């Protein structure tokens, strides 16, 4: 039942994201409501999170592959829909497997940003 509910919620959010794309084009992003602007952020994370690096391309692409378990995927999407991962950057969901990979990528992105800012302050 949890799998079905999550899947339907994802589909509904994606469908709503399409209509909001049209609306923001009509007037603009700021014209949407708080509710709708939170839904345009989660949807973009979902679209990025549905991509995955395949182990078959560990050679010609260079990125380690992932094999996400069924239960892990359900939990990851369920948490994302609720809004638990509303602080993680959008790009942390791009070409990753599972939720732990998202956290690891976010930490690496945060560390890289901190180092770059620290280097800039020196010069």
């Amino acid at each position: 039942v949890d799998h079905y509910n999550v899947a339907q919620d994802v589909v509904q959010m994606l469908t709503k994201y399409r209509e909001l794309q049209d609306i923001i084009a009509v007037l603009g992003i700021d014209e949407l409501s708080e509710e709708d602007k939170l839904i345009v952020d989660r949807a973009r994370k979902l679209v990025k999170f549905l991509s995955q690096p395949f182990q078959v391309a560990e050679v010609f692409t260079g990125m380690t592959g992932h094999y996400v378990q069924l239960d892990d995927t359900i939990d990851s999407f369920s948490g994302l829909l609720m809004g638990t991962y509303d602080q993680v950057p959008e790009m942390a969901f791009y070409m990753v497997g599972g939720i732990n990979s998202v956290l690891e990528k976010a930490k690496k992105m945060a560390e890289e940003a901190a180092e770059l800012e620290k280097m800039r302050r020196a010069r």
Partner: protein, 300 residues
């Protein structure tokens, strides 16, 4: 086959139509976004104009006792596809037709529509290019022509469209009484408790010299005209976006109905041909037969 391609040509035309209408949607989108600033910045210029002219009078006594030309200045769009705005305005004008009615419509749709329907009542119109922003000079041009159409006019009315929201466009009215009637009412408000909210305003204007009052009357009348045209433009672009979407969907439904008839036609065309060939193959086989078999039947 021509019949199949007839549908294909028909569907080919609808495809180009969708693209062109799509282009219109984008053009109007930019002008809608540019004109969306008025929504924020409206509703404050016309504050003392209300006191000058805001008079919730009856709709019968105003027109029944007309002894001088009643000039109407309906606002109409140059280009069609706007929606029901022009149609409603015509209904609003048709409902107030009278002996003394004179028409000075705005927009090509206004001139053409009101010239034929009410010949004697139409004198001439004003056409403005939608190239620059609706400015004061355009409003002054409307008023000057209106006066010269009928200087001894009991009232000058402006019938335009108010853009309440993206999907709400009402029909609004600005009635402007000529100088003589306005100063008479301005005189009663100052001298009496009646028109209380206008008591201080009436006395304030009464103190100053006449030429200033005449300038004040013309100035605020121009502002009311400026507001109407500005709102009518914003209602126009908003309406066109709604209408254009309707045309897109109608042209999409046709594309889905002519495609089926095209895919249904090719299937029938293939079947009919093969049946027809295979009915002329059966006939040839049936009419033909094998002759007496000349072989050593005994040798078996």
């Amino acid at each position: 086959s021509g019949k199949l391609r007839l549908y294909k040509e028909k569907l080919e035309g609808y495809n180009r139509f969708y693209s062109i209408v799509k282009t219109i949607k984008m053009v109007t989108l930019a002008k809608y976004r540019a004109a969306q600033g008025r929504i924020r910045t409206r509703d404050f210029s016309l504050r003392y104009t209300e006191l000058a002219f805001s008079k919730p009078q009856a709709s019968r006594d105003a027109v029944v006792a007309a002894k001088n030309a009643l000039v109407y200045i309906p606002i109409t769009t140059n280009r069609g596809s706007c929606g029901a705005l022009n149609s409603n305005i015509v209904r609003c004008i048709d409902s107030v037709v009278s002996s003394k009615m004179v028409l000075m419509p705005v927009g090509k749709r206004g001139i053409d529509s009101f010239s034929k329907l009410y010949p004697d009542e139409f004198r001439y119109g004003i056409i403005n290019d939608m190239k620059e922003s609706m400015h004061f000079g355009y409003a002054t041009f409307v008023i000057e022509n209106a006066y010269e159409v009928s200087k001894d006019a009991d009232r000058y009315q402006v019938i335009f469209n108010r853009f309440v929201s993206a999907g709400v466009q009402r029909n609004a009215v600005y009635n402007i009484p000529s100088y003589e009637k306005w100063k008479e009412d301005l005189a009663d408000a100052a001298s009496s408790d009646n028109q209380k909210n206008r008591y201080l305003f009436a006395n304030a204007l009464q103190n100053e010299e006449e030429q200033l009052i005449r300038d004040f009357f013309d100035f605020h009348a121009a502002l009311a005209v400026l507001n109407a045209v500005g709102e009518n433009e914003l209602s126009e672009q908003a309406a066109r976006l709604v209408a254009v979407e309707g045309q897109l969907t109608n042209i999409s439904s046709l594309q889905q109905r002519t495609s089926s008839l095209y895919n249904k036609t090719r299937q029938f065309g293939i079947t009919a041909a093969l049946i027809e060939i295979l009915s002329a193959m059966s006939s040839l086989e049936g009419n033909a037969m094998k002759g007496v078999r000349r072989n050593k039947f005994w040798e078996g």
